[PDB]
Amino acid sequence: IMNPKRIRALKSGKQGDGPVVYWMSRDQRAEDNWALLFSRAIAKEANVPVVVVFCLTDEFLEAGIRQYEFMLKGLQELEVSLSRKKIPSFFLRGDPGEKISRFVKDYNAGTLVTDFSPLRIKNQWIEKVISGISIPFFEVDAHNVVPCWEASQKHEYAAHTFRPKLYALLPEFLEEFPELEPNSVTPVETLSDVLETGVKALLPERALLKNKDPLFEPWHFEPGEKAAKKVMESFIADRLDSYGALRNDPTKNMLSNLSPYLHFGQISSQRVVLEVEKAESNPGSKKAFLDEILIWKEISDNFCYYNPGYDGFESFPSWAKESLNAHRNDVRSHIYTLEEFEAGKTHDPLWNASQMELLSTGKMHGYMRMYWAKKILEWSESPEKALEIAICLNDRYELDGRDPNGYAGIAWSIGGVHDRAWGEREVTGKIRYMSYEGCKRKFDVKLYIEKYSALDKLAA
DNA sequence: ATCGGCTTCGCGCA
DNA sequence: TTGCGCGAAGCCGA
């Protein structure tokens, strides 16, 4: 009934006479969720209800109010969404490995389902969970069109080798979603406290302007499943046609803007591809866009899955390692610390501008992110430091941060992963180089700089 | 084979 | 700002 290559058995065994509970984690949405549909499926063939369980963890302390509210404001809207289909959602606070354990016990779950994520800490949690349960345990890729473990059984060296695999698998996986049928059988803190608690927890780290005013502008992106869908519709109707020709222009904003929604799972990219595919646009712009949400977004999962040190210098390709190592003792033009990068006090004002876009909006322009990471590698004392600075700023300040897409982007920029070797230079070696004067022939750099000049002088 | 083609490069010049 | 060919560069896969 559903394509069963989207399921992997974690733990086998006997079905409890209790509810089917979805350990929701990555795909925080009620529609177009292959994982919650699997849950409803084996629930219905069991005459049991489905419930959903979410577990909140101290990981929010590692980022910002901006993300925590994006996720929490979302989950309030999910709660109404599930409840109106008779699906209870329960919200746990703590370590999954040992609270999902207690839950499975306290409620005698018939079976357990979770979505798929390649992040290391999730594979730790699944382990702590299996060790402590005896009921079955399933994982479902609800996040990729083509399940990650089916797309490829190895690390793909680049897109041109991955892309033929994905598209061969595409006609059998690109399909429509079925309706989420409500519970036939009507079947731990409240959500409002966790929001306010967390906020009081994070306020003293809040980026403030020099006049105590918060730096973040929460209005560029309304959180939520509802909201996500208006973003994609308006993008397919207004911006898709221009995506190819205007995407590399930080002065326009012809991006789809879906990445904070995708990251928190508030929208499936399968619904997106689906709607794009029937859309009558420029074939140029579709291909470019399909390629970003399909090849690049998914090889970003393949990356982390097959490379446990996805955030490490060790996961760069051999040639990139030799090159950067050969240039470790090169004199650097400038050397900034994390904090000088952080507050945009470099000599480059294009760079500082993108540091200001990231600080205030929560979302740096896809093209600028690539310049940003490279001038970090140029102006830091070592690669490993460069890498560690760009991760830290990516996850602290991007709304889409803490994401497979993030590590594999940084790897690309600093370490050449999924890229190729270019003319050898000082410091950066054979890693692909970008310049301010290459930026000038592509967009009106002065316009970008002008937009974010009013922040730097009043940052501290 | 073994060779072309490779996300998002820079640069000069029309 | 446009595009177009060339440049330096390591390596996958048909």
Ligand SMILES: Cc1cc2c(cc1C)N(C[C@H](O)[C@H](O)[C@H](O)COP(=O)(O)OP(=O)(O)OC[C@H]1O[C@@H](n3cnc4c(N)ncnc43)[C@H](O)[C@@H]1O)c1[nH]c(=O)[nH]c(=O)c1N2
């Ligand atoms: C230095 C640096 C740092 C990061 C990233 C790249 C670079 C160069 N990326 C990837 C990319 O920059 C990001 O996905 C886009 O900016 C998404 O913004 P839009 O949704 O507007 O993209 P746009 O509308 O152009 O593309 C649509 C979608 O395609 C996918 N996509 C586009 N560019 C991609 C890329 N380079 N890699 C993978 N998937 C891509 C994403 O799902 C994106 O939502 C990333 N992404 C992310 O979600 N979180 C992050 O924290 C980072 N970090």
